[PDB]
Symmetry: D2
Subunit: 83 residues, 4 copies
C-alpha cells in the first residue's frame, strides 16, 4: 500500500539507475559502473526476498478457516518460494 518500505527501496534503486546512466554517459570506469549496478541488483534481490517472506508470513498468520484448504494454500506458496 501507500507508504510501503518496498516502494521506498525501489525508488532508491530507481534513482541509483539514473546515476549509473550518467556514469555511462561519462565513460566512467567499468569497475565503478559494475559495482553500482551490482548494488542495484542486490537491492532488487533483497526486495524480492522480503516481499516473498512477507507474503508467506501473511499466508501462515491469516489462515483460512478450512485447515485442509490452508495446507494447500501454504503448499502452493512454499513451492513458489523454493523456485
Amino acid at each position: 500500500g501507500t507508504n510501503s518500505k518496498y516502494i521506498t527501496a525501489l525508488k532508491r534503486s530507481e534513482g541509483q539507475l539514473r546515476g549509473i546512466q550518467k556514469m555511462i554517459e561519462g565513460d566512467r570506469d567499468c569497475a565503478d559502473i559494475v559495482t553500482q549496478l551490482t548494488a542495484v541488483r542486490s537491492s532488487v534481490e533483497r526486495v524480492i526476498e522480503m516481499i516473498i517472506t512477507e507474503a508467506l508470513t501473511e499466508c501462515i498468520n491469516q489462515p483460512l478457516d478450512d485447515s485442509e484448504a490452508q495446507k494447500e494454500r501454504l503448499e502452493k506458496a512454499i513451492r513458489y518460494l523454493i523456485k
Copy 2:
C-alpha cells in the same frame, strides 16, 4: 532413509566427480570439464531444492496439534527456504 532417491542422485554426482577428476588428470579441454562440473553443481542445487521442498511439505502436512506452535514452526521453516 535407506532407499531415498536423493542418495541415488548424490551417488550419480559422486561418480561424475570421479569422471571429472580423470578429465583433469588427462588435461581435457577446460570447456568440457567446466560443462561437467556445472552439471554436478546443478544436480546438487536440485537436490537442495527438493530436500527443502520435502521438508516444508512434511511440516505443512504433519502439523502439531497446537495451531499457534505450528504457525511458528512453519515460519521458521519458510524463512529458511527464502534464505
Copy 3:
C-alpha cells in the same frame, strides 16, 4: 557515452521499477510483483555482463604497445570477469 544502448536499457529498468512501485501501492499479487522485479534483476544482470564483455574486448583489441604490460592488463581484467 551519450547515445549508449546501456543507458537505454537501464532507463527501461528505471521505468519498470516505477511501474512496480505502483503495483506495490496497489497491493497487486506478490507473484506479479516478483515476476516484474525478477525481470528488472535480469536486465541489470545482462547490462553488467555486456559492459564487462565490452570492456574486456576493448582491452584485447586496443592493446598497449608493450606486450608484457598488455598481458598484465588483460590478466587484471579477466580475474575481474571471473569474480
Copy 4:
C-alpha cells in the same frame, strides 16, 4: 595432470557427498544436510572459477605468435568466462 590440486578438491567434494548420503540414510536434520550440500556446491563453484581463471591466464601468457589470431583466441576465451 596427475597431481593437480583440482583433482584433490573434487575428491574432497566426492567424499563429502558420500557423507551426505549417510546423513540422508539417517534422516538427519534437513538443515544440516542442506548446509553440507551447499558447501559441496560452493566447492564445485570454486573449482569451476579457478579452472577458468587458469585457462585464461595460460591463454594470455602462452600467446600465439600471430597477434591477430591471439586476440581472437582471447576473445573466444573471455566471452566464455562472462557466460
